[PDB]
Design a protein around this nucleic acid. Structure first.
Ligand code: MN
Ligand code: MN
Ligand code: MN
Length: 327
DNA sequence: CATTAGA
DNA sequence: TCTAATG
């Protein structure tokens, strides 16, 4: 957690690189497992040799560990850090729509900057086009303050369209968080579950609602169960307009809500931990359900859920307010 | 890890 | 169809 830090972070740097600037899936995969095992080890690594005893720790990485140990640095690391092309990739990459693939492609084409990308909006797609447009705003955080204002409106039309809806704005938001990166709306309806072969309109209806009113401003992607977009709070009585916000609404079979809800609400750790427990408690949890375990090794059969409580009751735990679902 | 775009 | 990008 800190005793083996530099080595971990170094490695991950090492790793993230092969994956992005290079196509080295494996090497990359390599650095990762190592970066992982080394992280687990209870002692201070004092030499490669030492590291080397480890699983996945080869001659290659160990060599790397020595240099870092020995001198507060690494050239390869230093060289990349400098590498304009490489740099370039990391950059283009913050463009929502922009992935390593495009990144490289763009690069090779000579498009290395924000401006470049502008100059050739043509060479970009709608997603990337939007991304382009709201680069600054997509990079900006979202004050809960807004989170509150946003939530409000959303719940408002949701309700207006059909009173039978159920929306929950999950994530860190839901978790108390002073700020968030985007808004996650979980969505369901009685008239939609496991078997009840859709009602795409279920989704449809709302986005359309949201739009009609000006909450939704763009479409990143709209599918029959997952919309992905951009929003903004009505820029008040002037002098102060609002930054463009990434928003995501999703349809869910009323029969799987709370799990999903539980789930997306995190924290990643909370979940893992709760989930770990459900194992002892003779259960199974995952993003959609909760199944009782059968000694044969495994088992099925989806226990009925109506609330975040059921799942809790199930595994006989303490109801954790989302506030304190931190871990 | 599943959904969406796109080509 | 596959391939990429988000989450
Ligand atoms: Mn070994
Ligand atoms: Mn990106
Ligand atoms: Mn998200």
């Amino acid at each position: 957690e800190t005793l083996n830090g530099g080595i971990t972070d170094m490695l991950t740097e090492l790793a993230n690189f092969e994956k992005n600037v290079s196509q080295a899936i494996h090497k990359y995969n390599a650095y990762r497992k190592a970066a992982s095992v080394i992280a687990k080890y209870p002692h201070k690594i004092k030499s490669g040799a030492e590291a080397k005893k480890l699983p996945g720790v080869g001659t290659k990485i160990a060599e790397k560990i020595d240099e870092f140990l020995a001198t507060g640095k690494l050239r390869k690391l230093e060289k990349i850090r400098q590498d304009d092309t490489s740099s370039s990739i990391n950059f283009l990459t913050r463009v929502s729509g922009i992935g390593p693939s495009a990144a490289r492609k763009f690069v090779d084409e000579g498009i290395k900057t924000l401006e470049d990308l502008r100059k050739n909006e043509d060479k970009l797609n709608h997603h990337q086009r939007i991304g382009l447009k709201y680069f600054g705003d997509f990079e900006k955080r979202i004050p809960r303050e807004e989170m509150l204002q946003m939530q409000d409106i959303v719940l408002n039309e949701v309700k207006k369209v059909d009173s039978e809806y159920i929306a929950t704005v999950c994530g860190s938001f839901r978790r108390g968080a002073e700020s968030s990166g985007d808004m996650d709306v979980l969505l369901t309806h009685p008239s939609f579950t496991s078997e009840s072969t859709k009602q795409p309109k279920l989704l449809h209806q709302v986005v359309e609602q949201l739009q009609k009113v000006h909450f939704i401003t763009d479409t990143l992607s709209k599918g029959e169960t997952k919309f992905m977009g951009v929003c903004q709070l009505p820029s008040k009585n002037d002098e102060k307009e609002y930054p463009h916000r990434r928003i995501d609404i999703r349809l869910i079979p009323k029969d799987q809500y709370y799990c999903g809800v539980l789930y997306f609400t995190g924290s990643d750790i909370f979940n893992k931990n709760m989930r770990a427990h459900a194992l002892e408690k003779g259960f199974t949890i995952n993003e959609y359900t909760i199944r009782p375990l059968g000694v044969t090794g495994v088992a099925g059969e989806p226990l009925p859920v109506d609330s975040e409580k059921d799942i809790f009751d199930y595994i006989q735990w303490k109801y954790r307010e989302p506030k304190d679902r931190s871990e």
